[PDB]
Amino acid sequence: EIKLFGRWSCDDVTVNDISLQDYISVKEKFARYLPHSAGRYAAKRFRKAQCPIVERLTCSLMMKGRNNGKKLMACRIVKHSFEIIHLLTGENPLQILVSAIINSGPREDSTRIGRAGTVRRQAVDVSPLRRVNQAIWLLCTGAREAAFRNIKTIAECLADELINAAKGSSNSYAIKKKDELERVAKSNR
């Protein structure tokens, strides 16, 4: 009764990141089979760790006005792309997803409003509640412009950076623009 998330094995998925353990929970208490929830996943400050990540992996897709609204198409497009994550590197796709957030994680600073005035200095840490959700924010951009005037579709461009976000990534993708962000932040910090 724990098998078959979409079509594949569900368990044996490890968050291989100190200090991301005991905060990113995908399977170990969330054996929820489809990434559509009904009502509401926010009543207080701390709610995103209590949501399944694969639920959060879908809801960021509805943007840009004309695509805002249809979570079922987000349910359509991700379950039609896991086979591309299953055919490339034939191990189970869910272990590839949790490893994808690691290399796409900005585990570093951000730019801070100064302690007497305007914004020049560095915010010396970024919360995992802020970080890995913004790791979802970077990926949902780049495939759309990879499909906007290009006439390849997103289903291959979702699998574009995701096979690179799991391993050590190649040249600049949707995983990038944050690796660029910490170079100017290291000159900041």
Partner: protein, 62 residues
């Protein structure tokens, strides 16, 4: 740049445009260093957190 820092105590922010939790954290191998760092974003009490800059925290007295 590889050490991880766990939180013990929380204080407020110079928030308005870049709320960043000026917060009391300590390491594990360097757990005697309870340096009061500054994390951007919401943080629950009891969370171990990664870190690369392990030198200072830009102290203003509070």
């Amino acid at each position: 740049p590889v050490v991880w820092a766990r939180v013990m105590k929380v204080l407020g922010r110079t928030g308005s445009q870049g709320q960043c939790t000026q917060v009391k954290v300590e390491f594990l191998g360097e757990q005697n260093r309870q340096i009061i760092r500054n994390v951007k974003g919401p943080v629950r009490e009891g969370d171990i957190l990664t870190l690369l800059e392990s030198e200072r925290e830009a102290r203003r007295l509070r």
